[PDB]
Amino acid sequence: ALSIDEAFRKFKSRLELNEREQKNASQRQNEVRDYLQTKFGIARSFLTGSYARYTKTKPLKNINIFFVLKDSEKHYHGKAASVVLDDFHSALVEKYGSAAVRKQARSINVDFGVHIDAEDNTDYRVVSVDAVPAFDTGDQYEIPDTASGKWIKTDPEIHKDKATAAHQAYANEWKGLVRMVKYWNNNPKHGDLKPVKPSFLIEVMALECLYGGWGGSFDREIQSFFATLADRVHDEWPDPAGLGPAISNDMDAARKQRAQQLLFQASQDASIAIDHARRGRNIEALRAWRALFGPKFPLS
Ligand SMILES: Nc1ncnc2c1ncn2[C@@H]1O[C@H](COP(=O)(O)OP(=O)(O)OP(=O)(O)O)[C@@H](O)[C@H]1O
Ligand SMILES: [Cl-]
Numbered sequence: 389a390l391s392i393d394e395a396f397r398k399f400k401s402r403l404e405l406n407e408r409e410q411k412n413a414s415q416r417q418n419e420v421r422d423y424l425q426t427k428f429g430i431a432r433s434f435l436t437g438s439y440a441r442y443t444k445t446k447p448l449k450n451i452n453i454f455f456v457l458k459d460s461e462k463h464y465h466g467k468a469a470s471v472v473l474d475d476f477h478s479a480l481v482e483k484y485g486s487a488a489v490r491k492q493a494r495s496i497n498v499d500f501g502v503h504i505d506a507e508d509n510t511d512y513r514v515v516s517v518d519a520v521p522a523f524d525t526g527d528q529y530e531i532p533d534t535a536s537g538k539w540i541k542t543d544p545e546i547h548k549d550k551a552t553a554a555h556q557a558y559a560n561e562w563k564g565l566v567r568m569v570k571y572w573n574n575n576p577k578h579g580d581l582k583p584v585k586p587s588f589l590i591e592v593m594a595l596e597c598l599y600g601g602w603g604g605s606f607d608r609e610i611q612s613f614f615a616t617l618a619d620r621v622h623d624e625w626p627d628p629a630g631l632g633p634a635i636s637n638d639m640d641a642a643r644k645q646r647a648q649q650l651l652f653q654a655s656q657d658a659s660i661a662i663d664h665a666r667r668g669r670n671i672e673a674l675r676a677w678r679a680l681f682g683p684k685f686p687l688s
């Protein structure tokens with residue numbers, strides 16, 4: 389019979405990237421890069437965002453690939469964001485069909501048609517990539533921004549370095565706790581709209597909302613993490629690197645109130661699980677944790 393710690397560590401391992409998934413991400417990168425280089429001047433590409441920080445939850449969706457545009461494409465830098473995104477969109481629809489391709493704020497999503505079963509298993513295949521037109525300006529990158537109509541600065545290496553620093557200060561448990569809350573945020577039980585938008589905001593908040601080092605127990609850490617996220621979701625959350633626009637403006641007021649309510653509900657659901665465990669009702673506690681997170685949380 390599983391202890392609470394044993395169950396959380398199994399959950400954590402189920403959310404870790406493995407070698408077969410990595411090989412699949414690399415293969416999709418080759419496929420999309422080789423194609424896009426026939427349509428645009430692209431010097432190089434790279435896997436980035438949460439995928440590269442080991443903070444992307446499962447199943448693996450919306451893996452960012454920056455496609456670094458050559459000087460021959462510099463005309464795009466002085467044009468509206470929708471122009472380069474339109475061109476990337478049309479190219480990718482031509483190859484993958486309209487149903488598979490979706491415009492996003494700072495990327496085009498390509499969905500490979502990989503089946504996600506009800507247990508969140510894909511036979512070790514990535515679900516989709518976010519294709520990002522990008523210019524390397526020297527100090528950082530610039531990518532298209534639908535909200536402003538223009539281009540914004542981003543340095544994913546600052547995000548990576550600070551995720552690594554938080555993780556080292558948290559006894560190597562920070563990244564896993566982030567992936568667990570992102571798994572909860574993705575739970576179909578919440579409906580069509582996730583509690584927190586974008587998912588990246590959970591990680592930005594966690595840089596401040598996990599603190600004091602690792603406390604030693606997953607269940608208390610998760611409870612307090614949810615409670616802190618509820619209390620702070622209305623704060624301003626700038627780009628931590630100080631380069632791009634704030635991360636906290638994608639939710640309108642009603643959406644943020646809902647975010648706070650669902651995060652607080654999660655903190656209460658976690659408290660119930662903690663109370664079960666305190667009283668020796670261990671299979672009851674595991675059932676409470678599974679109802680909160682979803683099927684990847686184990687009962688045995
Ligand atoms: N406002 C911003 N300013 C600068 N960089 C940003 C901004 N928003 C996002 N980023 C960078 O772009 C990356 C991709 O954003 P995206 O929303 O696609 O999430 P992601 O990395 O896939 O994370 P998740 O798995 O949580 O969705 C981020 O991880 C971050 O490095
Ligand atoms: Cl959403």
Ligand SMILES: [Mg+2]
Binds near residue numbers: 437
């Ligand atoms: Mg993404």
